[PDB]
Amino acid sequence: VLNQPSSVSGSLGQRVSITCSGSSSNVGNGYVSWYQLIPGSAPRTLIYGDTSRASGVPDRFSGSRSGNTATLTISSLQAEDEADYFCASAEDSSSNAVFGSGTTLTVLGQPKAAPSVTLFPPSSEELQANKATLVCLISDFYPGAVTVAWKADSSPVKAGVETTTPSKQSNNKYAASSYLSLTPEQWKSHRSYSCQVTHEGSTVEKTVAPTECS
Amino acid sequence: QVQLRESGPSLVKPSQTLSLTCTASGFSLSDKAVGWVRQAPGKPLEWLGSIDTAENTGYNPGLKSRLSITKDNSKSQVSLSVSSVTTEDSATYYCATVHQKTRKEKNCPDGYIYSWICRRVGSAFCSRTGDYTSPSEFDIYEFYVEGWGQGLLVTVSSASTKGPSVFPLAPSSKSTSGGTAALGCLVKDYFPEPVTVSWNSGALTSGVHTFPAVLQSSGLYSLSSVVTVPSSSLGTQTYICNVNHKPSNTKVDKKVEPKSC
């Protein structure tokens, strides 16, 4: 595998560089390629032949190689550059491609935002099916480091909790979701449940009660 | 309009053999080479193999003993096959137009130059003993991926398919946020991925966001999609979520109505 930095970081408008270290038999042979993987979409071809730029790629992307080490440099770092980046080079044959361990690119400098939290109680339909699931949706926040906790009648709950990892939205702000899976008996053995989101010391807590409609 | 579309099963049991097909569009398979690449969950890209216009195949060494690539010029298709699958073979699979070329560059010793043979600079004579040397060639192997397809997600597991259960997430009177309100669908207990959700047959795209899926202890996946709508329209405009689970050829159109409290 071509050694890449596990994760690098950059700031809006600036210039950042990613390395790709192989051996004499892959990178040493030369002809390195770089590809961009945006969550959701299919990979893109960025660079070929150490330096050649693909069609439609802006001139801010540049590639170079020195011996057994290539480098991709992005200038005027934009927000659409938050992605994973991979290098690749043939080895002992034009049909044996070797890829790099991959690098995640983080763009900093964006406006902060506090999470807007919505807590849905079990739907009537789901209750009639002898199942109960509390859904806590967390939207529009930056940075993306949140913490969720569940309170059943002021006590902390850890069983039946499953939380997604935050993911960017279309508006480039983060989102996450947490589900509490309960049997209808558990759901009614308490008077209220609470979803607590901790983000920048602040804690947004929503609360639902089975007796009310919410 | 070069397009490359993958087709095949979304689930495969262990020990069996996964078989996929790549359908081309726009270009002729007799012109450009084609290869296959996979990426496991949270893993780096992995090379599989390629077939050229001369139907010659080259594979990833570590996986040669399980890989087979074929082509059909007429149907404009390329087929891939992987034997004795395991859970570690669960991944997303892409087919792509590739560029391959070997470049036979030669290198000369110090003090010499190519001109054919390596001749000493300033030699004057064509066949003087000590004014020429045999050039040694260095092969420079060229590879890069011209164009990519969408990608097909393949899961390896002994568990059996299951269709999803779609429940509403309706906005009550106490959930609104003034002129705006959040409503959604819950796609519960399905397997395997993927699931895709649209709203009002795609005619409602403003403010939609479909969350990643969680894998519960049951082995099944659950996922949620929500949309932000004017609170003025709740009770006038109808809102329907269109769920799609191809791994069980299911489509559910659930109508999310506002809660009447």
Curated annotation (Swiss-Prot), chain A:
GO terms for cellular component: blood microparticle; extracellular exosome; extracellular region; extracellular space; IgG immunoglobulin complex; plasma membrane. It comes from the Eukaryota. One of its GO terms (biological process) is immunoglobulin mediated immune response. The keyword Chaperone does not apply. It is found in: Secreted; Cell membrane. Disulfide bonds join 136-195. Keywords: Adaptive immunity, Bence-Jones protein, Cell membrane, Disulfide bond, Immunity, Immunoglobulin, Immunoglobulin domain, Membrane, Secreted. One of its GO terms (molecular function) is antigen binding. SMART domains: IGc1 (SM00407). Transmembrane segments: none annotated. Constant region of immunoglobulin light chains. Immunoglobulins, also known as antibodies, are membrane-bound or secreted glycoproteins produced by B lymphocytes. In the recognition phase of humoral immunity, the membrane-bound immunoglobulins serve as receptors which, upon binding of a specific antigen, trigger the clonal expansion and differentiation of B lymphocytes into immunoglobulins-secreting plasma cells. Secreted immunoglobulins mediate the effector phase of humoral immunity, which results in the elimination of bound antigens. Displays the following serological isotype: Mcg-, Kern- and Oz-. Immunoglobulins are composed of two identical heavy chains and two identical light chains; disulfide-linked. InterPro entries: Ig-like_dom, Ig-like_dom_sf, Ig-like_fold, Ig/MHC_CS, Ig_C1-set, MHC/Immunoglobulin. The lineage of its organism: Eukaryota, Metazoa, Chordata, Craniata, Vertebrata. Pfam families: C1-set. This is Immunoglobulin lambda constant 2. Residues 124-209 form the Ig-like domain. The keyword Cytoplasm does not apply.
Curated annotation (Swiss-Prot), chain B:
Disulfide bonds join 185-241. Immunoglobulins are composed of two identical heavy chains and two identical light chains; disulfide-linked. The lineage of its organism: Eukaryota, Metazoa, Chordata, Craniata, Vertebrata. Transmembrane segments: none annotated. It is found in: Secreted; Cell membrane. Immunoglobulins, also known as antibodies, are membrane-bound or secreted glycoproteins produced by B lymphocytes. In the recognition phase of humoral immunity, the membrane-bound immunoglobulins serve as receptors which, upon binding of a specific antigen, trigger the clonal expansion and differentiation of B lymphocytes into immunoglobulins-secreting plasma cells. Secreted immunoglobulins mediate the effector phase of humoral immunity, which results in the elimination of bound antigens. Residues 164-257 form the Ig-like domain. This is Immunoglobulin gamma-1 heavy chain.
